């Protein structure tokens, strides 16, 4: 109801660009908002109004309900799907993998795993060195890290969640209304 | 195509670039199917 509408308004404002979010300001009052009525409600640009309606038809916000006058009502579960997708993205950012094992040959640009070290290393001088490249090997250490980037990407998605906490609470209130 | 989809995609362009990609992939499989213009190397040189 009003909870779902307010929830949607928050996400679609911070989602679609100012011009498309303006379309969704009149689509928040999902009623007989036909393209004809929206040429006096949004006063957009006819063909361009229809173009951005197709940009909001990827989520079918107003369900393009063919009613000639057309009546649009928001019964789509896409808004719930999109916030859940954001939560899935935070988990994906957390799982970006970790440095694993590496000693890298700077000159030939080949990277070697630790088990490979038992062959990479030099027996006589005990100095790790390359195989196809014969130049002295350099331990990756900081070079080629998948752990620092993974943590940073996870933090950025997590930073969105306190701002998104109000939207999550609105979704919870809407869920209580449904049940 | 990836850069556009990743950054500021108009989407009208996306429909067309799909055609370029589809055309190019087909050309690897065969250079002269019905319709399907023969992609050329230089000055009318049908790609092997």
């Amino acid at each position: 109801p009003a909870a779902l509408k307010r929830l949607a308004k928050y996400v679609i404002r911070g989602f679609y660009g100012i011009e498309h979010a303006l379309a969704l300001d009149i689509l928040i009052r999902n009623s007989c908002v036909k393209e004809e009525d929206m040429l006096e409600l949004l006063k957009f640009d006819r063909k361009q109004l229809r173009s951005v309606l197709n940009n909001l038809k990827g989520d079918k916000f107003i369900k393009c309900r063919m009613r000639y006058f057309i009546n649009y009502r928001t019964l789509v579960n896409v808004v719930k799907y999109k916030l859940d997708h954001m939560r899935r993205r935070i988990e994906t950012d957390e799982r970006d993998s970790t440095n694993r094992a590496s000693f890298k040959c700077p000159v030939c640009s080949s990277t070697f795993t630790d088990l490979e070290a038992n062959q990479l290393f030099d027996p006589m001088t005990g100095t790790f060195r390359c195989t196809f490249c014969h130049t002295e090997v350099e331990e990756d250490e900081s070079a080629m890290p998948k752990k620092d980037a993974r943590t940073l990407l996870a933090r950025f998605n997590e930073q969105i969640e306190p701002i998104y906490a109000l939207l999550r609470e609105t979704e919870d209130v809407n869920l209580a209304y449904e049940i | 195509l990836r850069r556009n989809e990743q950054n500021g995609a108009a989407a009208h362009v996306i429909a067309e670039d799909v055609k370029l990609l589809q055309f190019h992939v087909a050309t690897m499989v065969d250079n002269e199917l019905p319709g399907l213009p023969r992609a050329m190397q230089k000055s009318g040189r049908p790609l092997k």
């Binding site: 911070g14 679609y16 300001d25 006063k43 799907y81 | -």
Partner: protein, 172 residues
């Protein structure tokens, strides 16, 4: 060509002169004789002046006359150039269908008004490049956050189904 009095488009010049003073910012109700004096077409002859009142003034669809003196007809509202923030406050009115042709001339150049508007909460977006202007406020509630466009790009399932079921299975 029906009936034409004296020079062609004398009424069009009269309309332009009425428009010029309003854009200048000097606004006064003007009788048909007064506008003719301003255009210097006042000595158009008695029959031609009668023709303008009987046909040319009647022909205009939006022509408005308060009583003795005619009043601005293309825009019924005065071009105040002020209270734009108040016009935005009523979102349903949405600036009372403000038009770019009405603007850039109400009493100042639009670019000067746009600089004032940018500082103010008012935001200007033009779906038609020159035909019309729209005034709206998105507020500070909307958040750019991180890779928002990429996140929308990732969710392109659209008609595809069972994606929600996968999310529900993770939720369980």
């Amino acid at each position: 060509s029906g009936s034409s009095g004296y020079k062609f488009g004398v009424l069009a010049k009269i309309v332009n002169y009425m428009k010029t003073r309003h854009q200048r910012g000097d606004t006064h109700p003007l009788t048909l004789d007064e506008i003719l004096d301003e255009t210097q077409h006042l000595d158009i002859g008695l029959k031609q002046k009668q023709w303008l009142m009987t046909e040319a003034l009647v022909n205009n669809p939006k022509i408005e006359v308060i009583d003795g003196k005619y009043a601005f007809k293309p825009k019924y509202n005065v071009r105040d150039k002020k209270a734009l923030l108040r016009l935005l406050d009523q979102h349903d009115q949405r600036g009372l269908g403000g038009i770019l042709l009405e603007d850039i001339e109400e009493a100042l150049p639009n670019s000067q008004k746009a600089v004032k508007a940018l500082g103010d909460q008012i935001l200007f977006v033009n779906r038609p490049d020159k035909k019309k202007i729209l005034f709206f406020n998105d507020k500070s509630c909307q958040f750019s956050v991180d890779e928002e466009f990429q996140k929308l790009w990732r969710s392109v399932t659209v008609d595809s189904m069972d994606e929600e079921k996968i999310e529900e299975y993770l939720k369980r």
